[PDB]
Amino acid sequence: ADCGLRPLFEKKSLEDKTERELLESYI
Amino acid sequence: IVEGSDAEIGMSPWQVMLFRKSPQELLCGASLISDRWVLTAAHCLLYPPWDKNFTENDLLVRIGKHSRTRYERNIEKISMLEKIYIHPRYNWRENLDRDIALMKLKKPVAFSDYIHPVCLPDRETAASLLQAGYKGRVTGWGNLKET
Amino acid sequence: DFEEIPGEYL
Amino acid sequence: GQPSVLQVVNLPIVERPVCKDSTRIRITDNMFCAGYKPDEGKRGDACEGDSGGPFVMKSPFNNRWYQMGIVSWGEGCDRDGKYGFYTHVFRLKKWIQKVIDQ
Ligand SMILES: CCOC(=O)Cn1/c(=N/C(=N)N)sc2cc(O)ccc21
Ligand code: NA
């Protein structure tokens, strides 16, 4: 499936302004 | 959402707005999980204490939206409900246990830059990520403040 | 305070 | 009191004892809670109108977004010592799959 990959972000390798806050919490 | 910020364009392309037809108003949020299936909270559709018991014809789902009130021509798609399915063991009487519902759409929605389904977790993704301190993201057009 | 939607979606 | 556009907030999952100790309501395994503690400084919560929306997480394993929760309930909005509760999507996925498979 193509689920959960956003055309304007993941699909273009662009990050949104706060997604890094999620990643940093996954310790 | 309280103490949030404006979403970026296309930041949450699975976000769905549940929209009441007559009195036109926001009912609830929801999410797109395939071209025909939308996931929501059972209490958005059935909650006796608040005199809520919507039928398919009472509502529309609006997909690809960003603006709360504006009609987003060429961007949002508005879909009609074929069928509502509420968890048979949804506990509206006590604690909202199993607060879940599915809505099948009449026609499939076309995916676009603004409309795209989210994944549902497998056992392993759930096990790894559902840990205290790990952050998730909530989105919606609900109140900015309690009062 | 919602903008009107097209009537085709009823 | 109402936003012009879609709102977003990132919130940490809360330890289950802390969720249970914040409320008189009986919590079940089909729920989890999220939000900052009073000690933590940062704030944020869902509120009425937000229900039914998704609580999503971005897998660091495959860079895909997963819907882990459904905005379900809270007592007030963004009150200190209170938290938002969310439907545990994985625990109800067998029902999800059953309905879709029709
Ligand atoms: C039937 C009860 O529904 C709700 O409690 C919805 N809801 C609220 N409702 C009201 N308190 N009127 S506040 C709240 C916070 C959240 O973090 C999530 C949902 C939510
Ligand atoms: Na709080």
CATH number at residue A20: 4.10.140.10
CATH at D63: 2.40.10.10
CA angle, residues D73, B76, B135, in degrees to nearest 5: 40
What single DSSP character describes residue D88? E
Q: How many domains does chain A have?
A: 1
Question: Which is the CATH superfamily of the domain at B1-147?
Answer: Trypsin-like serine proteases (2.40.10.10)
Instruction: Identify whether the C-beta of residue B87 lies closer than 8 Å to the C-beta of residue B100.
Output: yes
Token pair for residue D87? 């439907």
Chain C residue closest in CA terms to B23:
C2
Token pair for residue D30? 């089909």
Instruction: Identify whether the C-beta of residue A7 lies closer than 8 Å to the C-beta of residue B10.
Output: yes
Residues in B touching C5 (Cβ below 8 Å): 24, 60, 71, 78
Alpha-carbon B130 to chain mean position: 21
Token pair for residue D55? 């609580």
d(CA D56, CA D85): 14
CA angle, residues B106, B62, D10, in degrees to nearest 5: 125
What b-and-e string marks burial along D30-63, b requiring 16 or more CB atoms within 10 Å of the CB?
A: bbbbbbbeeeeeebbbbbebbbbbbbbbbbeeee
- Method in brief: X-ray
Range of the domain at D30: 1-102
Q: Which residue of B10, B33, B137 is in closest CB contact with A22?
A: B137
What are D68's strand-pairing partners? none
Residue for token digits 């939607």?
C5
Instruction: Report the pocket of ligand 1 as residue ranges, CB < 6 Å.
Output: B 43, 47; D 45-48, 50-51, 71-74, 77, 84
Range of the domain at A27: 1-27
Amino acid at B28: C
Q: Does residue C7 belong to the interface with chain B, where contact is any CB pair within 8 Å?
A: no
Amino acid at B68: R
Q: How many domains does chain D have?
A: 1
- The resolution, in Å, is 1.6
Instruction: Identify whether the C-beta of residue D12 lies closer than 8 Å to the C-beta of residue B131.
Output: no
From residue B20, alpha-carbon distances to C9, D80, D82, D91 in Å are 12, 32, 30, 29
Indicate yes or no: CB of A10 within 8 angstroms of CB of D63. Answer: yes
Q: Whose CA is nearest to atom 2 of ligand 1?
A: D73
